């Protein structure tokens, strides 16, 4: 099967700043992956991104009730859907599991299964944070509404100094600490 | 602070389409085109919200008719294939005889057609496997997750085999220990 | 609550 493929894409995007205080709306049409026509809440009308969408922008702007509908989309569509799922999306908090194990000139701190993805992980030498030789795997999205991240520490495991991994997450009112 | 995206697509000649909502990179729900049902990514979401799936079927039908129109405008220029980046990992640190899940992550690909198969010791495994629908991206390619819940053993060896038209031979990502 | 869909518009012919 080598016959050509043809893809149409439509993305109705809602962008929120400080919750529903500042909202931007984008009605975007795509041929394969190129945007050819777009309505921007800041612009107020459909505009052709490429000449491929030139016929649609002039046609859609002329339709009766179109602009009144699309210009109200921030209140009627973006702000509405925000509150429909605010309780289990914006307000979703899952506290994380923190696991510490060596793998040994490298000690690793594994933080798993938290939401949202905003997290801060530090490494304390003993009572002062080691800010050198620390590498992080970054924020990895598990795809099941949970996140995980791995911070490594290229330190010399010397018996008798305690090592503490400290994570900070919006799900907790106080930092979480785990000692080796 | 947050971004909610209603993402739709229709693909020819496969005659395949999907309709999903995305919140900060995660799926809220998608509409099963065959069953004409709303399918929530997390089962708990269905208790606090609802969605009339008939509106999605109407939107997919408009995208199908628009695709024929848009294909004419471009004088029948097809999509250019883009191969995927496949990554296999584990949502928890692996421990012997302690249940866990393997995550095959397919990223940065188009068109949204893939053959993904889990391989335990070179032999296909289909018991317990789950999969996500095609998820959008800012560059307007696609991404997808495949999950194989497994029990870690020192004997077993796992593989994720992905077939795409941007590749030649299948891409096979390994995992052991 | 009840989710809501921005409808798809028919392109000009």
């Amino acid at each position, epitope marked *: 099967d080598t016959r050509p493929r043809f893809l149409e894409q439509v993305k109705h995007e809602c962008h929120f700043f400080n919750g529903t205080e500042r909202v931007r709306f984008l009605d975007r049409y795509f041929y394969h992956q190129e945007e050819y026509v777009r309505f921007d809440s800041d612009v107020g009308e459909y505009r052709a991104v490429t000449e491929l969408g030139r016929p649609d922008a002039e*046609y859609w702007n002329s339709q009766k009730d179109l602009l009144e509908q699309k210009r109200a989309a921030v209140d009627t569509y973006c702000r509405h859907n925000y509150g429909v799922g605010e309780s289990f999306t914006v307000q979703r908090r899952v506290y994380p599991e923190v696991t510490v194990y060596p793998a040994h000139n490298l000690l690793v701190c594994s933080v798993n299964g938290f939401y949202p993805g905003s997290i801060e992980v530090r490494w304390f030498r003993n009572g002062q944070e080691e800010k050198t030789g620390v590498v992080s795997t970054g924020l990895i999205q598990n795809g099941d509404w949970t996140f995980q991240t791995l911070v490594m520490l290229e330190t010399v495991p010397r018996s008798g100094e305690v090592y503490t991994c400290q994570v900070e997450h919006p799900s907790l009112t106080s930092p979480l600490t785990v000692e080796w | 602070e947050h971004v909610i995206i209603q993402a739709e697509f229709y693909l020819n000649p496969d005659q395949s389409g999907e309709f999903m909502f995305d919140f900060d990179g995660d799926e809220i729900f998608h509409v099963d085109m065959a069953k004409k049902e709303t399918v929530w990514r997390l089962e708990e979401f269905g208790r606090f919200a609802s969605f009339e799936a008939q509106g999605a079927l109407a939107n997919i039908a408009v995208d199908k008719a628009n695709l024929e129109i848009m294909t004419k405008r471009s004088n029948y220029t097809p999509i250019t294939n883009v191969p995927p980046e496949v990554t296999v990992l584990t949502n928890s640190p692996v421990e012997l005889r302690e249940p866990n899940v393997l995550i095959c992550f397919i990223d940065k690909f188009t068109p949204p057609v893939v053959n993904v198969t889990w391989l335990r010791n070179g032999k296909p495994v289909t018991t317990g496997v789950s999969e996500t629908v095609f998820l959008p991206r800012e560059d307007h390619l696609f991404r997808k997750f495949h999950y194989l819940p497994f029990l870690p053993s020192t004997e077993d060896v796992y593989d994720c085999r992905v077939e795409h038209w941007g590749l030649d031979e299948p891409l096979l990502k390994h995992w052991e220990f | 609550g009840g989710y809501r869909a921005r409808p798809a518009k028919a392109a000009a012919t």
Partner: T-cell receptor
Amino acid sequence: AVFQTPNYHVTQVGNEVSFNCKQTLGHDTMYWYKQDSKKLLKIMFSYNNKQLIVNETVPRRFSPQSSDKAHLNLRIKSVEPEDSAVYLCASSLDWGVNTLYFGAGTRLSVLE
Amino acid sequence: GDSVTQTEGPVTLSEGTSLTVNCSYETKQYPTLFWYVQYPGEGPQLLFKVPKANEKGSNRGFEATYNKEATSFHLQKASVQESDSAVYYCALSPSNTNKVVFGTGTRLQVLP
């Protein structure tokens, strides 16, 4: 505007009747409504871009048709005396909540 | 399911009289409310619509308040003219899709 034909039509039970409607607003969605002497306004069919969305009518008696987004035609295979009413055509921007724009109406009289 | 109940029977007023067409609705979703007027010889026609819960609509001296707590959309005008003689329809539709439920229209006859 929304244009309907015919304006009036009288026929006998068991005959075939055909209604036609055109809207020039550029809208994607068109409707057929039945209005009776009691001034009750009930939907029969709704089309959005040549695809049927809503069907509230008796199964297998009617036959809507839409070759174009701006055209919506209705056909009654066999008219019963209860089909005597005013049939209104309407349009809306899309299938979402919108203003309905009606035509003048077709007055049908079905006689034994 | 979705229901709309408005004033029954013909209403006959002398010009200058205050009009009140009661409209009560019953819906499980969050709707937008409409008033439609049908002048003699024409089809129905949008008077005004209120999308959000506790706002007010107005047109041609008519006015109605979307009363979410009372589930009412009562139409009122302080001084009806002879040109207001028509049939008035109170309509409901959910905000997620266009499924418009009309009430039994109230015929208003304004006498000089």
